[PDB]
Write an enzyme that holds these catalytic residues in place. Sequence first.
Site, PDB file in Angstrom:
ATOM      1  N   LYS A  34     -14.245  -4.819 -13.298  1.00  0.00           N
ATOM      2  CA  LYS A  34     -13.333  -5.563 -14.145  1.00  0.00           C
ATOM      3  C   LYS A  34     -13.003  -6.909 -13.502  1.00  0.00           C
ATOM      4  N   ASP A  35     -12.975  -6.976 -12.159  1.00  0.00           N
ATOM      5  CA  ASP A  35     -12.735  -8.214 -11.418  1.00  0.00           C
ATOM      6  C   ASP A  35     -13.881  -9.201 -11.624  1.00  0.00           C
ATOM      7  N   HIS A  94       0.813  -1.201   0.000  1.00  0.00           N
ATOM      8  CA  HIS A  94       0.000   0.000   0.000  1.00  0.00           C
ATOM      9  C   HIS A  94       0.849   1.254   0.000  1.00  0.00           C
ATOM     10  N   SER A 148       0.018  -0.342  -6.585  1.00  0.00           N
ATOM     11  CA  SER A 148       0.223  -1.212  -7.729  1.00  0.00           C
ATOM     12  C   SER A 148       1.179  -0.603  -8.744  1.00  0.00           C
ATOM     13  N   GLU A 198       1.427 -33.932  -7.150  1.00  0.00           N
ATOM     14  CA  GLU A 198       0.410 -33.184  -7.862  1.00  0.00           C
ATOM     15  C   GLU A 198       1.095 -32.294  -8.889  1.00  0.00           C
TER      16      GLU A 198
HETATM   17  C1  HEM Z   1      -2.812 -16.081  -1.360  1.00  0.00           C
HETATM   18  C2  HEM Z   1      -1.965 -15.726  -2.297  1.00  0.00           C
HETATM   19  C3  HEM Z   1      -2.005 -14.329  -2.757  1.00  0.00           C
HETATM   20  C4  HEM Z   1      -3.030 -13.400  -2.807  1.00  0.00           C
HETATM   21  C5  HEM Z   1      -4.469 -13.545  -2.374  1.00  0.00           C
HETATM   22  C6  HEM Z   1      -2.480 -12.226  -3.372  1.00  0.00           C
HETATM   23  C7  HEM Z   1      -3.250 -11.097  -3.613  1.00  0.00           C
HETATM   24  C8  HEM Z   1      -2.722  -9.978  -4.231  1.00  0.00           C
HETATM   25  C9  HEM Z   1      -3.466  -8.849  -4.574  1.00  0.00           C
HETATM   26  C10 HEM Z   1      -4.929  -8.760  -4.350  1.00  0.00           C
HETATM   27  C11 HEM Z   1      -2.628  -7.921  -5.080  1.00  0.00           C
HETATM   28  C12 HEM Z   1      -3.033  -6.584  -5.574  1.00  0.00           C
HETATM   29  C13 HEM Z   1      -3.707  -6.774  -6.949  1.00  0.00           C
HETATM   30  C14 HEM Z   1      -2.839  -7.394  -8.031  1.00  0.00           C
HETATM   31  O1  HEM Z   1      -1.801  -6.812  -8.445  1.00  0.00           O
HETATM   32  O2  HEM Z   1      -3.147  -8.495  -8.562  1.00  0.00           O
HETATM   33  C15 HEM Z   1      -1.327  -8.471  -5.114  1.00  0.00           C
HETATM   34  C16 HEM Z   1      -0.203  -7.754  -5.549  1.00  0.00           C
HETATM   35  C17 HEM Z   1       1.041  -8.399  -5.461  1.00  0.00           C
HETATM   36  N1  HEM Z   1       1.336  -9.674  -5.046  1.00  0.00           N
HETATM   37 FE1  HEM Z   1       0.104 -10.992  -4.469  1.00  0.00          FE
HETATM   38  N2  HEM Z   1      -1.192 -12.422  -3.653  1.00  0.00           N
HETATM   39  C18 HEM Z   1      -0.840 -13.663  -3.307  1.00  0.00           C
HETATM   40  C19 HEM Z   1       0.362 -14.352  -3.445  1.00  0.00           C
HETATM   41  C20 HEM Z   1       1.470 -13.680  -3.933  1.00  0.00           C
HETATM   42  C21 HEM Z   1       2.688 -14.259  -4.224  1.00  0.00           C
HETATM   43  C22 HEM Z   1       3.002 -15.717  -4.133  1.00  0.00           C
HETATM   44  C23 HEM Z   1       3.537 -13.237  -4.616  1.00  0.00           C
HETATM   45  C24 HEM Z   1       4.951 -13.316  -5.006  1.00  0.00           C
HETATM   46  C25 HEM Z   1       5.681 -14.412  -5.057  1.00  0.00           C
HETATM   47  C26 HEM Z   1       2.835 -12.023  -4.589  1.00  0.00           C
HETATM   48  C27 HEM Z   1       3.458 -10.853  -4.911  1.00  0.00           C
HETATM   49  C28 HEM Z   1       2.656  -9.760  -5.138  1.00  0.00           C
HETATM   50  C29 HEM Z   1       3.252  -8.503  -5.608  1.00  0.00           C
HETATM   51  C30 HEM Z   1       4.698  -8.201  -5.843  1.00  0.00           C
HETATM   52  C31 HEM Z   1       2.251  -7.643  -5.802  1.00  0.00           C
HETATM   53  C32 HEM Z   1       2.377  -6.220  -6.279  1.00  0.00           C
HETATM   54  C33 HEM Z   1       2.261  -6.283  -7.774  1.00  0.00           C
HETATM   55  C34 HEM Z   1       1.867  -4.998  -8.427  1.00  0.00           C
HETATM   56  O3  HEM Z   1       0.696  -4.531  -8.348  1.00  0.00           O
HETATM   57  O4  HEM Z   1       2.692  -4.450  -9.148  1.00  0.00           O
HETATM   58  N3  HEM Z   1       1.593 -12.342  -4.162  1.00  0.00           N
HETATM   59  N4  HEM Z   1      -1.415  -9.740  -4.559  1.00  0.00           N
HETATM   60  C1  HEM Z   2      -5.189 -22.747   0.834  1.00  0.00           C
HETATM   61  C2  HEM Z   2      -6.203 -23.412   1.349  1.00  0.00           C
HETATM   62  C3  HEM Z   2      -6.256 -24.850   1.102  1.00  0.00           C
HETATM   63  C4  HEM Z   2      -5.652 -25.630   0.147  1.00  0.00           C
HETATM   64  C5  HEM Z   2      -4.729 -25.203  -0.971  1.00  0.00           C
HETATM   65  C6  HEM Z   2      -6.094 -26.954   0.425  1.00  0.00           C
HETATM   66  C7  HEM Z   2      -5.702 -28.048  -0.338  1.00  0.00           C
HETATM   67  C8  HEM Z   2      -6.207 -29.318  -0.051  1.00  0.00           C
HETATM   68  C9  HEM Z   2      -5.927 -30.426  -0.858  1.00  0.00           C
HETATM   69  C10 HEM Z   2      -5.034 -30.379  -2.045  1.00  0.00           C
HETATM   70  C11 HEM Z   2      -6.577 -31.502  -0.363  1.00  0.00           C
HETATM   71  C12 HEM Z   2      -6.527 -32.881  -0.956  1.00  0.00           C
HETATM   72  C13 HEM Z   2      -7.848 -32.948  -1.742  1.00  0.00           C
HETATM   73  C14 HEM Z   2      -8.268 -34.305  -2.222  1.00  0.00           C
HETATM   74  O1  HEM Z   2      -7.630 -34.798  -3.184  1.00  0.00           O
HETATM   75  O2  HEM Z   2      -9.277 -34.915  -1.763  1.00  0.00           O
HETATM   76  C15 HEM Z   2      -7.298 -31.060   0.779  1.00  0.00           C
HETATM   77  C16 HEM Z   2      -8.047 -31.918   1.567  1.00  0.00           C
HETATM   78  C17 HEM Z   2      -8.678 -31.362   2.669  1.00  0.00           C
HETATM   79  N1  HEM Z   2      -8.705 -30.100   3.123  1.00  0.00           N
HETATM   80 FE1  HEM Z   2      -7.860 -28.609   2.338  1.00  0.00          FE
HETATM   81  N2  HEM Z   2      -6.912 -26.957   1.489  1.00  0.00           N
HETATM   82  C18 HEM Z   2      -7.041 -25.733   1.949  1.00  0.00           C
HETATM   83  C19 HEM Z   2      -7.747 -25.229   3.022  1.00  0.00           C
HETATM   84  C20 HEM Z   2      -8.416 -26.053   3.898  1.00  0.00           C
HETATM   85  C21 HEM Z   2      -9.000 -25.600   5.075  1.00  0.00           C
HETATM   86  C22 HEM Z   2      -9.082 -24.208   5.625  1.00  0.00           C
HETATM   87  C23 HEM Z   2      -9.613 -26.636   5.676  1.00  0.00           C
HETATM   88  C24 HEM Z   2     -10.322 -26.446   6.969  1.00  0.00           C
HETATM   89  C25 HEM Z   2     -10.250 -27.537   7.671  1.00  0.00           C
HETATM   90  C26 HEM Z   2      -9.357 -27.780   4.853  1.00  0.00           C
HETATM   91  C27 HEM Z   2      -9.806 -29.057   5.100  1.00  0.00           C
HETATM   92  C28 HEM Z   2      -9.462 -30.114   4.244  1.00  0.00           C
HETATM   93  C29 HEM Z   2      -9.945 -31.472   4.527  1.00  0.00           C
HETATM   94  C30 HEM Z   2     -10.787 -31.947   5.682  1.00  0.00           C
HETATM   95  C31 HEM Z   2      -9.446 -32.230   3.549  1.00  0.00           C
HETATM   96  C32 HEM Z   2      -9.547 -33.708   3.410  1.00  0.00           C
HETATM   97  C33 HEM Z   2     -10.823 -34.183   2.803  1.00  0.00           C
HETATM   98  C34 HEM Z   2     -10.534 -34.287   1.347  1.00  0.00           C
HETATM   99  O3  HEM Z   2      -9.503 -34.829   0.887  1.00  0.00           O
HETATM  100  O4  HEM Z   2     -11.365 -33.765   0.604  1.00  0.00           O
HETATM  101  N3  HEM Z   2      -8.629 -27.357   3.779  1.00  0.00           N
HETATM  102  N4  HEM Z   2      -7.031 -29.716   0.945  1.00  0.00           N
HETATM  103  C1  LMT Z   3      -8.482  -6.145   1.598  1.00  0.00           C
HETATM  104  C2  LMT Z   3      -9.719  -6.454   2.438  1.00  0.00           C
HETATM  105  C3  LMT Z   3     -10.453  -5.227   3.007  1.00  0.00           C
HETATM  106  C4  LMT Z   3     -10.157  -4.830   4.457  1.00  0.00           C
HETATM  107  C5  LMT Z   3      -9.009  -3.822   4.592  1.00  0.00           C
HETATM  108  C6  LMT Z   3      -7.690  -4.556   4.654  1.00  0.00           C
HETATM  109  C7  LMT Z   3      -7.227  -4.496   6.083  1.00  0.00           C
HETATM  110  C8  LMT Z   3      -5.880  -3.825   6.008  1.00  0.00           C
HETATM  111  C9  LMT Z   3      -6.102  -2.505   6.699  1.00  0.00           C
HETATM  112  C10 LMT Z   3      -5.151  -2.489   7.886  1.00  0.00           C
HETATM  113  C11 LMT Z   3      -3.960  -1.614   7.550  1.00  0.00           C
HETATM  114  C12 LMT Z   3      -4.277  -0.157   7.819  1.00  0.00           C
HETATM  115  O1  LMT Z   3      -4.330   0.475   6.549  1.00  0.00           O
HETATM  116  C13 LMT Z   3      -3.790   1.790   6.585  1.00  0.00           C
HETATM  117  O2  LMT Z   3      -4.805   2.670   7.085  1.00  0.00           O
HETATM  118  C14 LMT Z   3      -4.955   4.025   6.612  1.00  0.00           C
HETATM  119  C15 LMT Z   3      -6.425   4.351   6.811  1.00  0.00           C
HETATM  120  O3  LMT Z   3      -7.297   3.198   6.920  1.00  0.00           O
HETATM  121  C16 LMT Z   3      -4.502   4.272   5.154  1.00  0.00           C
HETATM  122  O4  LMT Z   3      -4.319   5.676   4.944  1.00  0.00           O
HETATM  123  C17 LMT Z   3      -4.688   6.168   3.645  1.00  0.00           C
HETATM  124  O5  LMT Z   3      -6.064   6.549   3.599  1.00  0.00           O
HETATM  125  C18 LMT Z   3      -6.510   7.637   4.434  1.00  0.00           C
HETATM  126  C19 LMT Z   3      -7.960   7.964   4.053  1.00  0.00           C
HETATM  127  O6  LMT Z   3      -8.564   6.856   3.361  1.00  0.00           O
HETATM  128  C20 LMT Z   3      -5.585   8.877   4.399  1.00  0.00           C
HETATM  129  O7  LMT Z   3      -5.714   9.566   5.645  1.00  0.00           O
HETATM  130  C21 LMT Z   3      -4.085   8.553   4.228  1.00  0.00           C
HETATM  131  O8  LMT Z   3      -3.362   9.733   3.827  1.00  0.00           O
HETATM  132  C22 LMT Z   3      -3.799   7.362   3.291  1.00  0.00           C
HETATM  133  O9  LMT Z   3      -2.433   6.932   3.369  1.00  0.00           O
HETATM  134  C23 LMT Z   3      -3.179   3.548   4.852  1.00  0.00           C
HETATM  135  O10 LMT Z   3      -2.742   3.759   3.496  1.00  0.00           O
HETATM  136  C24 LMT Z   3      -3.327   2.056   5.153  1.00  0.00           C
HETATM  137  O11 LMT Z   3      -2.080   1.368   5.033  1.00  0.00           O
END
Ligand code: HEM
Ligand code: HEM
Ligand code: LMT
Lengths: 383, 111, 85, 85, 244, 244, 54, 54
Positions: A228-229, A202, A206, A272
């Site tokens: 767009k999302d 932040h 981006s 996998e």
């Molecule tokens: C649970 C996995 C992740 C989630 C939910 C997540 C989510 C996001 C989101 C919502 C943003 C802002 C929007 C976007 O640019 O797409 C972002 C930006 C970014 N993420 Fe992730 N991310 C994940 C994993 C990762 C991983 C594995 C990496 C790097 C290895 C990464 C590196 C970044 C970077 C560098 C940015 C800034 C990119 C930019 O806007 O120029 N994130 N991520």
């Molecule tokens: C990043 C989040 C997660 C990933 C990537 C993930 C991935 C997986 C994978 C790959 C399997 C094997 C699936 C299969 O072949 O049957 C699995 C099984 C399972 N996961 Fe997750 N999991 C996630 C989150 C969770 C969470 C939060 C729970 C909460 C308990 C959960 C509960 C289970 C259970 C009970 C199974 C075994 C039953 C089954 O195989 O379907 N998982 N998960």
């Molecule tokens: C993504 C899911 C949605 C839930 C929000 C994500 C939770 C993360 C929030 C916790 C971190 C606190 O986030 C921080 O707070 C303040 C205000 O909220 C932001 O502050 C920003 O916005 C406010 C007004 O909107 C301005 O006064 C300020 O100049 C600007 O920098 C910071 O840029 C941010 O880093």
Amino acid sequence: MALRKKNSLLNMANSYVLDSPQPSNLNYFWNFGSLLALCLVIQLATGITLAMHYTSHASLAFDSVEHIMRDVNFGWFIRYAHANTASFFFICIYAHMGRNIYYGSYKTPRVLPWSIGVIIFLLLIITAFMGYVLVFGQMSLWGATVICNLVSAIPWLGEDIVHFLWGGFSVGNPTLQRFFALHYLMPFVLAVFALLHLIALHTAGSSNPLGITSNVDKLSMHPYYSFKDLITVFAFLLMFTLFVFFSPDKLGHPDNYIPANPMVTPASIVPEWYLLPFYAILRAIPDKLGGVIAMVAAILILLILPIVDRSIIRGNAFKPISKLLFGFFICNFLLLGVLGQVHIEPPFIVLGQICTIFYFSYFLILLPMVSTIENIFFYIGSL
Amino acid sequence: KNVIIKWRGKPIFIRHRTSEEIEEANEVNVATLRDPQTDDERVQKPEWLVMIGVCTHLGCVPIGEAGDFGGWFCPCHGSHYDISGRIRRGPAPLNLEIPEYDFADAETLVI
Amino acid sequence: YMGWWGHMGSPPQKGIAGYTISPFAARPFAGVVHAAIFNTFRRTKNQALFVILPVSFFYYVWTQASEKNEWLYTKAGRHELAKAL
Amino acid sequence: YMGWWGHMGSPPQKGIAGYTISPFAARPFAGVVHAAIFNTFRRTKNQALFVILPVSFFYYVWTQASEKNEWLYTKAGRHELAKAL
Amino acid sequence: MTAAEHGLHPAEYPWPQNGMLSTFDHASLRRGYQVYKEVCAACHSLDRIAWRNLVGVTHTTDEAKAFAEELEYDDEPDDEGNPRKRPGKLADYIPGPYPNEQAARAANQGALPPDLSLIAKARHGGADYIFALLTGYPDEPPAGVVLAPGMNYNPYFPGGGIGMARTLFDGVVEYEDGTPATTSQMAKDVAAFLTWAAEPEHDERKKLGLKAIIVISAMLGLSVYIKKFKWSPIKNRKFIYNPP
Amino acid sequence: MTAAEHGLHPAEYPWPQNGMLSTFDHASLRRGYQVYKEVCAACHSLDRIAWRNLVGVTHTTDEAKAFAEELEYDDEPDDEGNPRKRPGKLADYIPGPYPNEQAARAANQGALPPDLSLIAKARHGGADYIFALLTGYPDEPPAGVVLAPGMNYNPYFPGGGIGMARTLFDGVVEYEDGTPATTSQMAKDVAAFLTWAAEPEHDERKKLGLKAIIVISAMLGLSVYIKKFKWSPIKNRKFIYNPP
Amino acid sequence: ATTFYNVFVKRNSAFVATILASAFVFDMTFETAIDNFWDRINAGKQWKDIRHKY
Amino acid sequence: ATTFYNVFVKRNSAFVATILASAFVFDMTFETAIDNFWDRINAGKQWKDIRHKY
Ligand code: HEM
Ligand code: HEM
Ligand SMILES: CCCCCCCCCCCCO[C@@H]1O[C@H](CO)[C@@H](O[C@H]2O[C@H](CO)[C@@H](O)[C@H](O)[C@H]2O)[C@H](O)[C@H]1O
Ligand code: HEC
Ligand code: HEC
Ligand code: FES
């Protein structure tokens, strides 16, 4: 002053999802972040639901998964949704990482979100690996056996550590119960790190596909990127639907529908699909310890991109040679994936070694050289 | 005689080998063996062949005394093991695994 | 390096006039057919080499390797396989 | 309603001089025995009624209720229990 | 590996259930149950299927209760704590031919016939593999194959030597619906049946997927219009620059 | 409720293990095991205790293996899949007198003797309740108590009528250590033993608690010094105010 | 006193090292001391006290 | 057209009410329509088609 800005709690939401200033020119590859958020939500919902029906005891685990498939209302859907979304999570994560590498999102001032991101990627691998074990089919068992015996390569203490993780002398009930507890927990840790990398981002905002500042021209996150999302959410859900409803087993391995049998070894233990490139890297090094280090280094080497990219320009949009090199890097990463699932036979043994060298040499040689030369070409070429 | 002790679900073959049995096992040139090993590598005591009696092919239990190398014969796909419990003929890739066993007494072993 | 609305961190702007029309006044799909055909063609043509070259190379490598592997595990490939191991 | 160091939201302060000495220069337990005895006595005496009154009242209520209940479920209390139900 | 070590890959047969919009043929499912009951059930269990699972798929409630009531299942002990048997109910699982693995292996020259409840999901190939295997025992093994004793040559089985002999021959079953019970017909029916056993949600899953496809497609189309609509002020923006 | 409906509350007896620093008397534990084995085990199980649990508490490894090896336990089936028995090992649980609840109740005029592994934790009173109950059968029920058939009067048992008769009489056990086996002695020993069975960590738990008490107390004392030290500049602050 | 300060306390690296080494020694000695004390207050009661009969 | 706008669209309370009522109707009718279509493309295959023999 408007409530969304005045109230501290609302203001945090506001700053991230509504008034957040975004570049006005993000392309569709900036949508993987929100898809990864959607995958994480689907995995939490389906995961918690499966946990309400799953039994972690090794005498009952496999049968509890059959109960889910056969007896629970929509259990088939919840199970296949959870299993397939794990594959989609890795498609989106590789895409998101690919976007970041191509557009130079790892450069200053975004080194911190990038470095936290690399840890998110490690947690995802561990999470998915543990989940795979919970089924306690043949791939579950043989996966846990093989992967936890890599830890045996840690010198001096490795064997001891393995027995400690298994909770005994082989993969069995203690292992299964502890993987259940950890698999439940890890996604919550992963969500926290996901949130940390956003808070880190932040400060800079981006990046954008041109690699220039966007401070001159910003757009509110809502409504423009909200809407767009939605397009990619529906595109994702279309793909999800095709797998979950029409081909729920296409991405998986039949061997996991056979209950774990410590005696019988499956024909081939392959991970996998999304782990396959790292597996190919590990096979390339003949030494056990060497192989493990290489495999971990293949992920941790991403942490040095901020150093080895010497370009004065952010990203590849305007860099023809860097674009070619990136193309070869990505294709090699896919070839590694394919070599991860072939048999250890000629001529794939040497090929895997060459692909492994190419993988590392991108970070260590080519990217530093190419980025240096492009700097000079931009300067001389525009004189 | 050959005993079958279950140990961690896996069967353990314990054979009390005679002198001439030991001799028969010490013959086969290591060179011509899918899994090349000599009896000395297998046993810590020549009178106590202790092995994990799971066939290395798929995972059936070989019937002892039967075979073609007069050791163990897996009836499932017809793989023949030796008096060292080395694989000689049939689909099985490896020799019958050796557990970690120690002679606490000369009359009792722990596995 | 990024501020917030009002103090985003732009260098001072002066001399640019920006104009736009309401979403309800515009045709959202104006010139969509032209873009879908001609614009996509231009953008794809310009990026084609960067996809074609690496994909074709790595596909060729794989094809050669998979064909050799297949041949080594035939009867005809017995001798070459013996040397390769 | 609260700021941060430098702009906490105090009304302007002027005219107060504050003085203190280093932790290493002070005896941390200076006058501890006097405080432990006399200060605690003063502070406890001043608050005693606010604890004693409600506690003593509710304890009395409970005592009466528990004794009646006990008596109703004796032989002697048979008749009174019959009426109470 | 050698092709032999992998097994021959089965043909892609046109199953009725292949096709995004296609259910199982339930008449084939019923015939397949009859093959299972009269041929496979001698050696193979179907432990994950309860009698109730057949109802409204292959059999009416009455027919399934009849099947259950013919068997004896373990009851809760009597009042002296002695063991007792009861007749089966719809909630009971279809009982297997052997009491334990050891008895199973003893009856099958060491080999353990797998449970068939998931076999269609647990092998590459699915119905096609089951069909190919049951119909693919050649009269004579290819010259030069040495079969171990008690093995049968079948090219679809990895390694070639399978402990299960050919079992389907023309007219081993007499179908109750008058269908000619040829080897191929019985293999097709039983393969259909086992596929149903592995994935009994199949028909419902594909209908819900059709609904999901339609709704999600419409939402995708509308989401594109709405995006274009909301974005048009940004896409259509024009500038005029007068350098200061 | 009437006192009868509650049961008489047991006295507080001075057990050796009462006391923050006190372990069980292991000689009493051993004697208590002998009472369990010779009297209670006729009707009551001790299902949560394995032979290995006695080792280094009441018995040496040899004595416990001897006890286990005298019994037969169910083995895995033989190669023809026929059932088999084996001699007991240290990992085996102490086997109960009855195969199921129904058999237990049939032998005890309808009453089910509970498992004694947790009984000391599962009743208000603990060892004191067990001791009071076993020793508290009066020769004659208080005049006017009507016992249901198969019930015995015992005031410590809620309601007064218990299905378990008096079982400890002077010299029903002959202790191997020469201790006179009086009703009171046997009740004391068996109550100690059952308390150990319910909480076998008791001795270790109290020793670790002693270490924790000492360290945590020291840390508390030091934490107060450090707090006072760091706070002294704030507590000692003085002001001089000159109104502007 | 100055000497003691200069060597073990002035540098935090040295202070932390001294604390950890002291923790190691305390841990080892305290274990042994409690063990012996526990054995004396519970004398004749523990298995170690009656083991010799068997 | 103005009338339609004024009644169903202008007030968001009315718009949301119209959307939800439409969702209810769509849900009910779409269910029925898919049911019938599914039965026609899978004719003679489903249990409902063979049930009559038993
Ligand atoms: C649970 C996995 C992740 C989630 C939910 C997540 C989510 C996001 C989101 C919502 C943003 C802002 C929007 C976007 O640019 O797409 C972002 C930006 C970014 N993420 Fe992730 N991310 C994940 C994993 C990762 C991983 C594995 C990496 C790097 C290895 C990464 C590196 C970044 C970077 C560098 C940015 C800034 C990119 C930019 O806007 O120029 N994130 N991520
Ligand atoms: C990043 C989040 C997660 C990933 C990537 C993930 C991935 C997986 C994978 C790959 C399997 C094997 C699936 C299969 O072949 O049957 C699995 C099984 C399972 N996961 Fe997750 N999991 C996630 C989150 C969770 C969470 C939060 C729970 C909460 C308990 C959960 C509960 C289970 C259970 C009970 C199974 C075994 C039953 C089954 O195989 O379907 N998982 N998960
Ligand atoms: C993504 C899911 C949605 C839930 C929000 C994500 C939770 C993360 C929030 C916790 C971190 C606190 O986030 C921080 O707070 C303040 C205000 O909220 C932001 O502050 C920003 O916005 C406010 C007004 O909107 C301005 O006064 C300020 O100049 C600007 O920098 C910071 O840029 C941010 O880093
Ligand atoms: C009298 C014995 C017997 C009969 C009858 C029998 N099987 Fe089998 N079956 C076996 C044995 C034994 C195996 C294990 C073969 C092996 O592992 O070598 C087996 C294996 C299989 C396998 C799995 C092969 C694999 O890939 O592991 C399937 C599928 C199968 N049988 C289905 C059937 C069907 C369908 C029928 C009849 C309609 C049937 N069987 C009849 C004994 C039998
Ligand atoms: C031959 C029968 C028999 C013998 C011997 C016997 N019991 Fe019991 N015991 C019972 C029955 C029956 C009950 C259940 C009585 C009831 O619930 O009415 C019982 C109940 C108990 C209870 C639980 C009372 C409660 O609060 O529920 C304890 C504790 C107990 N026995 C301990 C012992 C001990 C200790 C011994 C001998 C050292 C012993 N028993 C000997 C039959 C026996
Ligand atoms: S299983 Fe031992 S021979 Fe195939």
